[PDB]
């Protein structure tokens, strides 16, 4: 059992809080996205598919403040994050490459890459959180040859942004002085976009400059009500960048340049709105969640960044975390038990709940409703 | 370098006769569902995604005569073919297997289950010509504890369906008594509907009454012109089902439902015009090629299966399949030399050539002019 197949029953339920899938419903212009599909598919089947390609990789990436990003010109297109990370699993294998992996975190990178026999051993987020540590304690604690973090990091949306780029820099000193490879996880880097002291600066100017071995997975599937019609991208270090095109040209050929077309048309919407529909929806949902919780056995952790995902601590006596999703449940509330983000311990996570908020407000208001009256005993 | 980066240059070029992806254009009926996405975007954003996985996966075998398949009912759904061979791939490391796999087949198959540190050894397709001998040669021939078919294959359309039941049934005799791990993908079987000696019989009722240990994937982006906006099946013996789920479910959660709704209704189409909208546009390009090519150096080798590419044998004291792409490429044709198909000893794929058939026929008719014209001054 793992949090997707939690994730598949809670499809199925109207109060489903579990997957961070996004199911909010359309802003007005996303409405009329929605009516140019049949242009849309006639565009792409006209076109070059390199031309939608290059078209969605550029609006990505500028919405993204990645210049350096299309300088290389080096990124390769998948279906999923998850694939995109089998494909570092193909290269870590290959080169023999053990994997430091960011705890707590959702529990598929650790299983995906555990089923392609990555030895895998874990680090506490806690470890990036005092800026001037993150040196010494990578140095005492990571022994293999890879570190893969993500960032911002789900479900508690801590980020190195923090620390302005000094978290990153120190992370990247480490790996480039140890001849470690980097491997990190963006997927909730567009929750910091716009933000006054935390929007992402271009990481990819860091990682060349640095001349560390690095791979790096960016992705659209958390940040746009899509349906799963998404894209992922992952970019290579110059280094390894010919082994890893020969991989990922073994998983495809290229993803549908229709959904390259249609997504191309979500960034550039949201360059035009500065993220406005995806945040305002979030901003409600987590205001609605804190509000009704306040004072309850749900404690709130505050995050550093605004992602999808809100992170609840258990605050009683004799109650677990997975007593509270059962509870719930009973009640048609489906919230993700912690246990399995502390996916080297899990009796570790037996004290948190994570709730998504990538939902319509209506429902979202609904489901704490029912929620509050079942913590109220 | 393999056959998909070569498909990646192809696609660049106006006379791409590479990659076996679907590039004809909409049937009058297939427009109307493209002037319906909107509406098919509404349903699957407010609808369930197991009402949408649930009749995909109805419609997809209720067209390929699998009902089996539905009363098993376990069946999982991946983004593509490519992606259902990396979980049963995962499967072949975890249980540290090596493969008996088919040769010649597309080299993608070969090199995914290679970065998965499968070990791969191959069997040539002339095992399965002769049904009497199937059994005996397996025996010889198959020192693994798996064995992975295509079937129809890719690219020369052979199929055990040339012995109606009985290839398949010595096949699955054969796994069964010596316990041997049977994976078959499925991908090109669309192109034996219908067909009045050749249409699939179902495979699920064999291999369930075998108890043969499977797995067998289906697709759809290879029939209809989707826009590589598509669905891949894979489905598993009972007594490995729980493994392969576990695995599956470590890759995603689900295909996107407005995808889904989408596929369902090219499958439903076609049920309703016999798959005469995707046969026709293949027959018209097969026909264009024989009749273009006949008496030239490139020998049309005639496919047990109507399936969508086109296989030719280099027919030339000097020249091989490399030569040919190389002049071909330089007035604007690209094909795929062989070598890459013979994935074990790509030196025995300078014989040969494929052609992508899922073309536009106005396209086609003139991409095959400008190659007799070329061949012609060699
Ligand atoms: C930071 C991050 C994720 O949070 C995440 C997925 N999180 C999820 C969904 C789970 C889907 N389940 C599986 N992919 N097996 C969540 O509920 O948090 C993925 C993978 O993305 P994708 O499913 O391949 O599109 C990559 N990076
Ligand atoms: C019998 C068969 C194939 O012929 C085939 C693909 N053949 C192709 C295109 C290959 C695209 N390249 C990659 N998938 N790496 C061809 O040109 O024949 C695949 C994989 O399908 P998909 O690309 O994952 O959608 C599975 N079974």
Same mark, same amino acid.
């Given at each position: 059992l793992d949090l997707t197949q939690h994730e598949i029953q %809670? &499809?199925?339920?109207?109060?489903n809080l579990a997957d961070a899938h996004t199911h909010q419903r359309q802003s007005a212009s996303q409405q009329s996205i929605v009516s140019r599909l049949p242009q849309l598919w006639y565009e792409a089947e006209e076109g070059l598919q390199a031309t939608y390609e290059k078209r969605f990789t550029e609006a990505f990436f500028q919405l993204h403040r990645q210049p350096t990003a299309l300088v290389k010109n080096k990124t390769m297109l998948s279906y999923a994050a998850s694939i995109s990370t089998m494909v570092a699993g193909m290269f870590l294998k290959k080169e023999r490459l053990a994997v430091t992996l960011i705890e707590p975190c959702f529990d598929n990178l650790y299983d995906v890459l555990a089923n392609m026999d990555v030895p895998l051993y874990p680090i506490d987020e806690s470890v990036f959180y005092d800026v001037d540590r993150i040196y010494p304690e990578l140095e005492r604690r990571v022994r293999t040859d890879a570190l893969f973090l993500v960032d911002p990091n789900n479900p508690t949306g801590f980020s190195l942004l923090r620390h302005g780029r000094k978290g990153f820099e120190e992370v990247v000193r480490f790996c480039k002085d140890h001849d470690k490879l980097l491997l990190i996880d963006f997927c909730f880097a567009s929750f910091t976009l716009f933000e006054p002291e935390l929007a992402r600066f271009d990481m990819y100017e860091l990682l060349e400059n640095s001349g560390v071995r690095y791979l790096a997975i960016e992705?659209?599937?958390k940040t746009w009500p899509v349906q799963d019609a998404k894209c992922a991208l992952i970019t290579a270090s110059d280094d390894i960048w010919e082994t890893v095109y020969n991989l990922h040209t073994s998983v495809l050929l290229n993803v549908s340049p229709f959904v390259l077309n249609m997504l191309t048309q979500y960034v550039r919407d949201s360059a035009a709105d500065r993220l406005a529909s995806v945040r305002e929806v =979030?901003? @409600?949902? @987590?205001e609605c969640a804190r509000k009704t919780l306040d004072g309850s056995i749900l404690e709130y952790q505050e995050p550093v960044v605004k992602v999808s995902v809100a992170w609840f601590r258990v605050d009683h006596p004799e109650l677990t975390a997975t007593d509270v999703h059962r509870l =719930?449940? %009973?009640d048609g509330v489906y919230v993700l038990p912690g246990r399995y983000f502390y996916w080297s311990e899990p009796s570790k996570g037996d004290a948190y709940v994570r709730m998504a908020l990538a939902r319509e407000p209506e429902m979202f208001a609904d489901a704490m %409703? &029912?929620?509050?009256?079942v913590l109220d005993r």
């Open positions: %809670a &499809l199925t339920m109207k109060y992705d659209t599937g =979030l901003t @409600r949902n @987590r =719930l449940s %009973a %409703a &029912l929620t509050r009256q």
